[PDB]
Amino acid sequence: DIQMTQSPASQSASLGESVTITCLASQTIGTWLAWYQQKPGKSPQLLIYAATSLADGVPSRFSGSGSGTKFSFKISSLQAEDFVSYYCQQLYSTPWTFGGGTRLEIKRADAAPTVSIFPPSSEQLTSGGASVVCFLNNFYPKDINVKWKIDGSERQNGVLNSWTDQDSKDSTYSMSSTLTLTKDEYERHNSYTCEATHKTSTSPIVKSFNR
Amino acid sequence: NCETKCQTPLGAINTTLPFHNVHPLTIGECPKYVKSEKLVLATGLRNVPQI
Amino acid sequence: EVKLVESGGGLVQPGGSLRLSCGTSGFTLTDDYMTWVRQPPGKALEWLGFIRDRANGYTTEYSASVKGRFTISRDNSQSIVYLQMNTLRVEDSATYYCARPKGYFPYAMDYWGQGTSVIVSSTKTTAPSVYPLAPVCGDTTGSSVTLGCLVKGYFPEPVTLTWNSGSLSSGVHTFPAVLQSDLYTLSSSVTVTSSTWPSQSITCNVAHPASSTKVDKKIEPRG
Amino acid sequence: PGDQICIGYHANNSTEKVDTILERNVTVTHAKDILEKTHNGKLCKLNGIPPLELGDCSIAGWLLGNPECDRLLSVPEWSYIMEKENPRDGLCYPGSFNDYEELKHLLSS
Amino acid sequence: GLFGAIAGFIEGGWQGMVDGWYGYHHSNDQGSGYAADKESTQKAFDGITNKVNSVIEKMNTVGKEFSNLERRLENLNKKMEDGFLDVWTYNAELLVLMENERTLDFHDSNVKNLYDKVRMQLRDNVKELGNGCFEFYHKCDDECMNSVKNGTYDYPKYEEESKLNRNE
Amino acid sequence: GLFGAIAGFIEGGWQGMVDGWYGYHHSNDQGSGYAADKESTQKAFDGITNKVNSVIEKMNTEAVGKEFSNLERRLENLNKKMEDGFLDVWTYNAELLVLMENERTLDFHDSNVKNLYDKVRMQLRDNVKELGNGCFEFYHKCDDECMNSVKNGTYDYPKYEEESKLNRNE
Amino acid sequence: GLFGAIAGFIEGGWQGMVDGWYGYHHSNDQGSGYAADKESTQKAFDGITNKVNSVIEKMNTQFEAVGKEFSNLERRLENLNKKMEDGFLDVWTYNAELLVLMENERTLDFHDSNVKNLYDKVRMQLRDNVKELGNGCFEFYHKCDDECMNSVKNGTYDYPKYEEESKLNRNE
Ligand SMILES: *[C@@H]1O[C@H](CO)[C@@H](O[C@@H]2O[C@H](CO)[C@@H](O[C@@H]3O[C@H](CO)[C@@H](O)[C@H](O)[C@@H]3O)[C@H](O)[C@H]2NC(C)=O)[C@H](O)[C@H]1NC(C)=O
Ligand SMILES: *[C@@H]1O[C@H](CO)[C@@H](O)[C@H](O)[C@H]1NC(C)=O
Ligand SMILES: *[C@@H]1O[C@H](CO)[C@@H](O)[C@H](O)[C@H]1NC(C)=O
Ligand SMILES: *[C@@H]1O[C@H](CO)[C@@H](O)[C@H](O)[C@H]1NC(C)=O
């Protein structure tokens, strides 16, 4: 029906700065755009209506602009609690579509991914499975890679990756990769290696262990 | 077999409104009893038929 | 004031059904344009449809994604807007909000409910297996020791993870669950400092209200 | 004959009627009725606590233990008390009750 | 009523404008239509909400038995309750009437101010018909119409073009 | 004065006009005279009558004499404080109602005159000088039929249009 | 506001008119300046003094409590005394808050009107000898010396004197 294209999907910035999300309509929706904030773990909150018009009881630092197709949304003086999701929505014609979303992240000095290895539990070993865990903790920024090596050789199946969001206090991320396989396959090898390539170091951070 | 936060001899009230004409004597937390038959705020504007 | 609250979320077999209830409270000037909007987690928001006020004819509009399956209705007596969902499919899994304009004219959704989540799978509710994770045997040389919990095999979400009754939890990172083979897997890490462990001992506590399981695994060194 | 723009205001099928100082029975596009006229017509529990039903006992009758009133001998908590205007079962053995009204205002607390 | 716009110089309502309390209608070669002015509408709504709220908040604030020797006391009680009743009923009924009056006039005024805004913007680049319509002395396309609506209209741009046509 | 007409750009009243509250004064070759606009006058009157009818009707529904012993003094004073209290309440109500309403009534008339004036102006248009005194000077010649046309508010513009605008411009 | 002057066609206030509530800004060859209109100001202030005085006088006489004590046999009487003092207290509290709110709405409208009225009185004199811009300002076809400015401000402005010059400057 009507498509709403919101960019950037993610943007980083720092306190006091001025940030601008754009929203683009496949039709001309005239002046029927609206802008929402979503704090994490909560329902959305209305910020702007009629594109350029602040809802009651909203900070003056929030602004919006545009008409027809092209639309803009701005946080003038950025703030601690502002780094969250934002969405546009077109109320021009049913269905009242939304934009893709914009994640706002706070700018931080890059950080070291403290990396921990976890051979499967005897309690787990008795049950027929074996799951081995690499924890990659407290590191900025969030782009990162992990290779699993077994007796030095790469491995593909059974890798489970999971991430956190920006931490409230430290503004840094974390990760966990769980390599999962049979007890059979597990006892069938010798040394297990988890290697984290991050931008931070020149050279990849290697935590491995044997038996 | 019933529940209310507001009670009159004639019956119970559940309402979001400021006033009630239902009864003088009421127990519980209740809207302001008045003698009025009607109270209606205009919100919208005059409906003026067109040409 | 207004305060919309919604209810009735759960887990269903696909092909199945569910009925969601968004109730309204507070003084207001308008019931009109009550909308249902869902958010599959990690995805954007998607608009399901709306139903209108009595005076406007109880008329209803739907997203063509769910059209013909879902039905929006209101019982004014209990002052609720129901979303009756039929023939549930896998992509119907999401969290659900009712939302409302404050005005007479729908320029934006002013009032939201708190959300309620529905899941759809063929997967049967399944208890988690909590294994505690001991660090290396090569002895910890370090300035800080880190150790963690692995909670595997459970369906459906959520599980609630507290270290040591929540006495010691901070410098803790719980990475949200992932889907491996039809059923979820979770995990978490607490980093302590070298003095504080194994000496002072810590245990991991895990609740899965879906299968009713509450379980404790204390973490032990290997040797 | 040139291009044209107009200002105007909303209209609808509204039958809604309001009064003002200057004018009565005016129709408006939108209105809110702020007076609640209706009730469920039932006597009910109040904040999830039931009232004390005296039945045909007077307050006095119940407090004295009039034989007819024996069903009220033990009672739980009450949100309010219900008395008939003229209860049959007062004091069986006839007599008087001093400061009766004050005692009722006390029972109300 | 007071500001003379609703049921005023602007003679009737628009069943055709469904999105707002107040708005525009235009026609040009690109097309014709109704458009609500959503700002003014929503703002008026906020005002009315404030009004009715304040009426509720300001208003938001048992029996006894007596003997037959207590006739004056009983009556004193009755007269009191009845007194307060009469006072509050009066306050309500009155408040409702007066605020109603104010409300209608508020709407009228809103219309008048909107119209005025458009007029004072367009100046002599248009004929003012007095029905609430202005007929343009220059060609006004959808961009120009929106510029009028969104408050940006450019007078010097259409100025002498309008002039010549107004003259000839 | 709120709408700015009475004691406004219309600087004062006309003893001359005895037939109504608002009206017109024409001067042309046939004669000069005052004419009232009776629909406006009567409609305002009907409005006002409704108003005072309301401030009567609302205020309708007392003092019963009671007697008290000397051991009754607290009671007696209570009773007094109650009747006196209600009295002060109703007196306040009446006084305030009357002041407030009075303001509204004058502003009402004011608005009415503004409205009549504007209703003329938005009709006459370019055909006249607007003198700022509440009067309009004609660019053309207006027979009493034309005057009357303005008064009942028909006044077709085109038939006097050019016949004015030339005389205007040159 | 309600009359559309304040936060109206006049988009904002002037920090540099210190001499009154409403007034004039002018510019011409011999200079520019802010000048208050003292008449209408003092007039408005007179209205406002009246208003507050009305509030005070009107609310002057009303219900006060005087202290009383009741025994343990008197409880009904005591509750009646309370419910009364409380009732009147509540009533007058409603009167004060409502009167203040209502009169405030009215005061702000009142000024809006005063500004409007000012604009209208200037404009309806100046007539077609000026352009009406709609920001609240007028541009002069004829040159206007400070004597003519003052003549506008004090109400005496002569149209026919500048009529032909303004017309001339206008039509070419
Ligand atoms: C005032 O009246 C309203 C409307 O009658 C009440 O709201 C509704 O209360 C009913 C109680 O029967 C609720 O229905 C119940 O819901 C529960 C939970 O799902 C369920 O277990 C019961 O079988 C029954 O269906 C209903 O949810 C509720 N509606 C809203 C809007 O939330 C209200 O309780 C009354 N008083 C107040 C204001 O609490
Ligand atoms: C209003 O009424 C007319 C006829 O009664 C009808 O044509 C129109 O659709 C109605 N409008 C609405 C939306 O109720
Ligand atoms: C107003 O609308 C015009 C025409 O659409 C547009 O070009 C301009 O950017 C808008 N300006 C403002 C300040 O709203
Ligand atoms: C008005 O001001 C002028 C200055 O231009 C002055 O000469 C004249 O006396 C004043 N007239 C009145 C009526 O105050």
Side-chain angles (χ1 to χ4, degrees):
Chain A
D1 329 76
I2 294 169
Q3 294 177 335
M4 301 304 304
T5 305
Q6 177 169 2
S7 55
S10 156
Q11 162 94 14
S12 76
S14 257
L15 251 115
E17 296 173 351
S18 196
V19 174
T20 305
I21 313 172
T22 26
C23 207
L24 214 137
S26 50
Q27 249 93 308
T28 152
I29 60 175
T31 189
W32 289 76
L33 192 64
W35 287 100
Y36 296 91
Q37 164 180 258
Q38 211 177 15
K39 275 158 183 181
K42 308 284 178 190
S43 43
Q45 163 152 11
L46 179 61
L47 244 32
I48 304 182
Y49 73 97
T52 42
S53 149
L54 284 212
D56 245 23
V58 174
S60 83
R61 63 199 210 264
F62 300 98
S63 39
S65 140
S67 297
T69 50
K70 316 143 188 181
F71 288 106
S72 334
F73 166 85
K74 184 168 127 181
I75 308 188
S76 84
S77 339
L78 245 187
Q79 226 125 311
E81 67 281 36
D82 290 345
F83 292 80
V84 274
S85 299
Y86 297 83
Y87 297 89
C88 56
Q89 175 189 26
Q90 164 272 120
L91 286 96
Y92 185 71
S93 111
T94 74
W96 290 333
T97 48
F98 290 83
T102 289
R103 291 182 183 174
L104 238 38
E105 277 132 12
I106 201 165
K107 273 185 190 241
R108 179 60 178 163
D110 329 47
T114 324
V115 35
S116 297
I117 4 152
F118 296 87
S121 106
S122 48
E123 309 84 302
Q124 160 183 196
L125 241 324
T126 17
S127 54
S131 285
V132 33
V133 184
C134 259
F135 285 140
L136 277 61
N137 288 7
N138 305 73
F139 67 111
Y140 189 79
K142 30 119 143 215
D143 312 313
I144 200 171
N145 288 315
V146 169
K147 237 131 151 41
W148 288 94
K149 286 192 156 93
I150 296 180
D151 302 350
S153 192
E154 71 288 286
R155 215 262 177 159
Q156 69 291 345
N157 200 298
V159 187
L160 259 44
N161 288 338
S162 212
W163 269 268
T164 64
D165 296 318
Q166 189 129 128
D167 202 301
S168 26
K169 179 191 174 191
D170 27 323
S171 339
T172 182
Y173 307 83
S174 316
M175 196 196 155
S176 109
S177 179
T178 301
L179 184 96
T180 297
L181 53 144
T182 84
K183 171 179 179 261
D184 220 14
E185 292 168 323
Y186 170 73
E187 317 272 44
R188 221 152 171 85
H189 301 90
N190 268 300
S191 190
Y192 291 79
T193 311
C194 165
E195 106 186 342
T197 108
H198 192 221
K199 169 255 150 149
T200 32
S201 42
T202 11
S203 357
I205 312 92
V206 174
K207 250 56 198 150
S208 175
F209 79 98
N210 41 58
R211 245 39 229 156
Chain B
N1 185 88
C2 150
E3 150 71 15
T4 181
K5 285 167 268 188
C6 173
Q7 185 76 55
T8 79
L10 303 183
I13 305 177
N14 204 323
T15 195
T16 72
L17 301 186
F19 309 90
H20 85 91
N21 69 6
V22 183
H23 196 269
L25 313 183
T26 88
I27 319 174
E29 289 162 357
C30 289
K32 187 139 217 147
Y33 177 81
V34 289
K35 276 179 179 159
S36 311
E37 291 166 356
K38 58 180 288 196
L39 288 175
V40 177
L41 293 172
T43 59
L45 58 141
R46 200 181 283 259
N47 220 352
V48 174
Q50 23 190 87
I51 330 146
Chain C
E1 43 169 345
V2 192
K3 316 257 195 284
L4 320 175
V5 258
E6 68 255 289
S7 40
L11 162 65
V12 204
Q13 253 104 72
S17 302
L18 198 37
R19 186 193 71 173
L20 263 35
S21 298
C22 157
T24 319
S25 109
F27 188 91
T28 200
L29 306 183
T30 279
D31 276 337
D32 192 9
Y33 279 112
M34 198 81 216
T35 59
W36 281 106
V37 155
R38 77 189 179 188
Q39 201 171 38
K43 204 28 173 49
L45 298 153
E46 187 192 354
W47 179 94
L48 309 181
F50 63 68
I51 200 193
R52 307 215 38 185
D53 65 9
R54 164 129 214 146
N56 273 240
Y58 284 130
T59 151
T60 176
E61 292 213 47
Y62 304 83
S63 151
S65 68
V66 305
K67 181 237 190 61
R69 309 189 256 148
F70 298 5
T71 312
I72 307 182
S73 51
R74 39 190 340 158
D75 170 40
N76 319 68
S77 267
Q78 300 225 119
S79 92
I80 306 186
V81 174
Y82 308 113
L83 181 68
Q84 177 57 78
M85 321 166 77
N86 297 340
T87 310
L88 268 314
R89 331 239 212 78
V90 196
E91 322 82 4
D92 294 339
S93 325
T95 152
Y96 285 69
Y97 306 94
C98 61
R100 238 242 278 156
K102 74 183 303 162
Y104 288 117
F105 312 93
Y107 304 150
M109 307 268 94
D110 281 282
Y111 293 137
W112 297 67
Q114 88 287 350
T116 218
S117 161
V118 338
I119 329 281
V120 103
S121 85
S122 260
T123 310
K124 189 48 187 104
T125 315
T126 313
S129 295
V130 172
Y131 316 124
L133 300 171
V136 300
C137 209
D139 274 314
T140 33
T141 44
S143 195
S144 286
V145 58
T146 100
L147 43 122
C149 213
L150 196 270
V151 186
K152 186 183 183 226
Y154 65 81
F155 200 90
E157 272 264 78
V159 284
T160 18
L161 199 138
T162 153
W163 293 99
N164 192 31
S165 64
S167 149
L168 297 122
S169 334
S170 162
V172 202
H173 299 359
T174 327
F175 324 93
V178 291
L179 206 117
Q180 183 234 359
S181 142
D182 313 358
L183 39 90
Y184 295 100
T185 278
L186 191 112
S187 47
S188 170
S189 97
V190 87
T191 158
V192 249
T193 46
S194 59
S195 70
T196 357
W197 187 93
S199 43
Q200 197 162 17
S201 313
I202 33 197
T203 165
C204 147
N205 328 114
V206 162
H208 196 198
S211 30
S212 320
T213 84
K214 179 60 184 190
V215 138
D216 301 333
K217 293 284 189 124
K218 356 273 147 177
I219 312 205
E220 285 283 354
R222 185 69 219 254
Chain D
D3 289 338
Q4 248 217 7
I5 191 162
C6 312
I7 313 306
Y9 45 95
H10 182 68
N12 53 34
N13 284 333
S14 173
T15 243
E16 283 314 87
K17 233 120 254 262
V18 298
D19 297 325
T20 76
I21 284 311
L22 247 26
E23 219 169 354
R24 312 224 242 119
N25 232 29
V26 186
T27 314
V28 292
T29 61
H30 304 82
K32 178 70 185 198
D33 172 28
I34 69 179
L35 166 79
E36 165 64 54
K37 313 145 215 68
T38 65
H39 56 78
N40 72 8
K42 318 180 182 278
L43 294 168
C44 311
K45 325 191 319 247
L46 175 58
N47 276 85
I49 296 164
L52 169 51
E53 248 157 330
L54 294 194
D56 266 302
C57 318
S58 66
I59 283 290
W62 151 59
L63 286 193
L64 284 165
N66 184 292
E68 316 277 346
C69 284
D70 267 40
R71 54 196 244 280
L72 311 176
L73 255 142
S74 246
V75 294
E77 228 183 343
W78 62 74
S79 22
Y80 64 102
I81 321 171
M82 296 167 48
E83 200 184 21
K84 318 229 172 210
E85 205 74 43
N86 197 297
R88 260 162 224 131
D89 291 302
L91 350 83
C92 25
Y93 199 100
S96 75
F97 208 116
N98 303 320
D99 303 286
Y100 188 52
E101 299 88 4
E102 278 276 326
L103 184 73
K104 290 190 157 201
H105 189 246
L106 161 66
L107 282 206
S108 71
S109 313
Chain E
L2 270 68
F3 296 89
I6 300 179
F9 66 105
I10 291 158
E11 190 128 342
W14 291 341
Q15 286 257 352
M17 190 169 65
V18 252
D19 332 272
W21 273 334
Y22 332 115
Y24 317 85
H25 180 104
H26 75 288
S27 47
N28 54 14
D29 299 335
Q30 249 138 320
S32 110
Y34 292 105
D37 177 294
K38 292 187 258 337
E39 208 160 43
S40 178
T41 306
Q42 203 46 46
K43 281 185 307 213
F45 185 82
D46 299 337
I48 299 296
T49 300
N50 276 335
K51 173 186 296 232
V52 54
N53 276 345
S54 87
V55 188
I56 292 170
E57 298 163 357
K58 289 309 128 105
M59 223 66 89
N60 207 135
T61 44
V62 94
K64 292 184 211 40
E65 280 184 39
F66 303 93
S67 77
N68 60 358
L69 271 116
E70 272 159 340
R71 295 321 188 174
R72 297 168 310 161
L73 186 46
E74 168 172 15
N75 185 251
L76 206 162
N77 213 33
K78 194 222 192 283
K79 279 188 317 159
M80 185 202 76
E81 297 174 341
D82 268 19
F84 284 135
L85 178 49
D86 286 351
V87 178
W88 288 107
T89 307
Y90 166 98
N91 294 342
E93 294 187 338
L94 188 73
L95 186 48
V96 163
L97 289 173
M98 295 174 60
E99 278 321 297
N100 279 350
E101 185 107 81
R102 299 276 302 178
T103 291
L104 295 179
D105 298 332
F106 175 53
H107 284 297
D108 195 343
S109 169
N110 281 327
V111 181
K112 217 259 169 27
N113 291 332
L114 180 46
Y115 179 77
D116 267 336
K117 235 192 129 216
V118 164
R119 171 174 70 71
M120 296 180 73
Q121 173 147 240
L122 292 182
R123 282 157 76 168
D124 66 334
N125 280 4
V126 306
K127 199 177 289 121
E128 179 173 3
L129 314 176
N131 52 350
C133 282
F134 306 90
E135 189 185 314
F136 285 84
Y137 279 131
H138 69 83
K139 263 308 194 197
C140 197
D141 55 64
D142 289 353
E143 275 316 304
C144 151
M145 283 282 197
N146 301 332
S147 96
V148 164
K149 295 196 223 152
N150 94 320
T152 57
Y153 168 81
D154 206 314
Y155 178 85
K157 177 134 97 53
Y158 303 100
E159 187 179 357
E160 49 179 313
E161 169 180 0
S162 323
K163 169 116 69 41
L164 307 186
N165 263 296
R166 167 175 68 256
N167 297 334
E168 120 210 323
Chain F
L2 210 72
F3 298 90
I6 298 188
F9 68 103
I10 302 177
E11 203 175 325
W14 291 345
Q15 293 274 1
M17 174 167 308
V18 324
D19 314 274
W21 268 334
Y22 329 110
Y24 316 86
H25 176 44
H26 80 316
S27 123
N28 60 12
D29 347 50
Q30 307 74 312
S32 96
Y34 298 98
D37 176 290
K38 298 164 250 48
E39 200 168 75
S40 310
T41 303
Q42 196 54 24
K43 183 201 56 70
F45 184 86
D46 287 344
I48 307 279
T49 315
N50 276 328
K51 154 186 295 199
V52 329
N53 271 338
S54 313
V55 323
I56 281 172
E57 164 210 71
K58 285 326 189 180
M59 209 106 60
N60 286 83
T61 31
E62 210 201 278
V64 167
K66 282 200 197 52
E67 213 143 316
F68 293 104
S69 106
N70 58 38
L71 308 124
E72 264 161 25
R73 294 263 162 274
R74 279 163 318 149
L75 203 40
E76 176 204 85
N77 190 279
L78 204 149
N79 191 71
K80 168 161 156 174
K81 269 173 54 221
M82 187 204 85
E83 285 160 6
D84 231 304
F86 282 125
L87 172 47
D88 295 314
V89 163
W90 287 112
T91 303
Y92 163 96
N93 287 354
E95 287 183 359
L96 198 56
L97 197 43
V98 185
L99 294 148
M100 276 176 105
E101 276 329 310
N102 282 346
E103 181 133 280
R104 301 292 302 270
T105 286
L106 308 186
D107 284 346
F108 181 55
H109 290 298
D110 197 21
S111 144
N112 291 325
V113 164
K114 195 226 192 25
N115 281 14
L116 182 62
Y117 174 85
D118 277 326
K119 197 180 313 163
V120 161
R121 169 187 58 89
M122 289 177 161
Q123 259 202 358
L124 297 217
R125 314 237 253 119
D126 336 74
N127 245 204
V128 276
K129 289 307 221 169
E130 200 185 350
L131 300 180
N133 58 339
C135 303
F136 304 90
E137 201 188 37
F138 274 91
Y139 274 144
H140 73 75
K141 299 302 210 165
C142 215
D143 52 332
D144 289 1
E145 181 243 33
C146 178
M147 284 316 195
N148 299 13
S149 84
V150 186
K151 294 178 194 177
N152 78 324
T154 57
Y155 182 82
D156 93 82
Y157 185 27
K159 87 180 268 198
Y160 301 103
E161 182 171 350
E162 243 104 27
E163 192 253 288
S164 299
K165 85 158 112 136
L166 292 175
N167 200 277
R168 166 190 152 196
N169 253 288
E170 69 211 356
Chain G
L2 195 75
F3 298 98
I6 296 154
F9 55 89
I10 311 181
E11 260 204 303
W14 298 341
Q15 267 287 140
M17 166 164 289
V18 220
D19 302 305
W21 272 332
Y22 336 103
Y24 316 84
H25 187 44
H26 78 88
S27 100
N28 61 359
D29 303 330
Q30 55 274 51
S32 71
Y34 296 111
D37 180 280
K38 272 95 71 285
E39 289 167 1
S40 46
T41 307
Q42 194 49 46
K43 184 163 148 157
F45 187 85
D46 283 349
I48 301 297
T49 314
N50 277 320
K51 200 188 254 250
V52 296
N53 277 357
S54 304
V55 175
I56 299 166
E57 284 159 354
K58 289 292 145 294
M59 219 99 36
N60 244 339
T61 319
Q62 67 96 33
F63 185 83
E64 54 137 271
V66 85
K68 284 167 180 129
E69 262 161 60
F70 308 92
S71 85
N72 30 307
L73 290 322
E74 273 162 328
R75 278 301 161 267
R76 292 174 297 136
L77 195 54
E78 154 169 355
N79 187 261
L80 177 36
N81 195 66
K82 209 237 250 145
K83 289 288 233 326
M84 187 191 94
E85 303 196 329
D86 256 318
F88 283 120
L89 173 59
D90 268 347
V91 169
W92 284 106
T93 298
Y94 167 100
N95 299 338
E97 312 199 278
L98 199 65
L99 184 52
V100 178
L101 291 193
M102 273 172 136
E103 279 330 298
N104 281 339
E105 184 55 28
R106 289 176 189 184
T107 297
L108 300 183
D109 293 330
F110 181 55
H111 295 276
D112 197 30
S113 170
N114 298 343
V115 186
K116 171 87 153 32
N117 277 348
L118 192 50
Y119 185 84
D120 274 329
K121 100 131 198 224
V122 152
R123 170 191 63 94
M124 284 195 187
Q125 292 168 159
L126 285 194
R127 264 198 265 168
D128 59 70
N129 292 348
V130 284
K131 264 184 297 184
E132 177 169 15
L133 322 173
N135 54 342
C137 277
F138 305 97
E139 217 208 76
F140 277 95
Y141 288 144
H142 68 88
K143 162 83 215 267
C144 161
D145 108 280
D146 295 19
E147 285 305 302
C148 115
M149 279 307 189
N150 291 33
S151 90
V152 174
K153 306 192 244 165
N154 89 326
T156 65
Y157 175 69
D158 196 277
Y159 178 84
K161 176 179 187 190
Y162 303 98
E163 178 167 21
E164 65 313 314
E165 170 189 356
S166 315
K167 168 157 51 185
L168 244 190
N169 263 313
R170 164 159 96 263
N171 289 263
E172 76 190 83

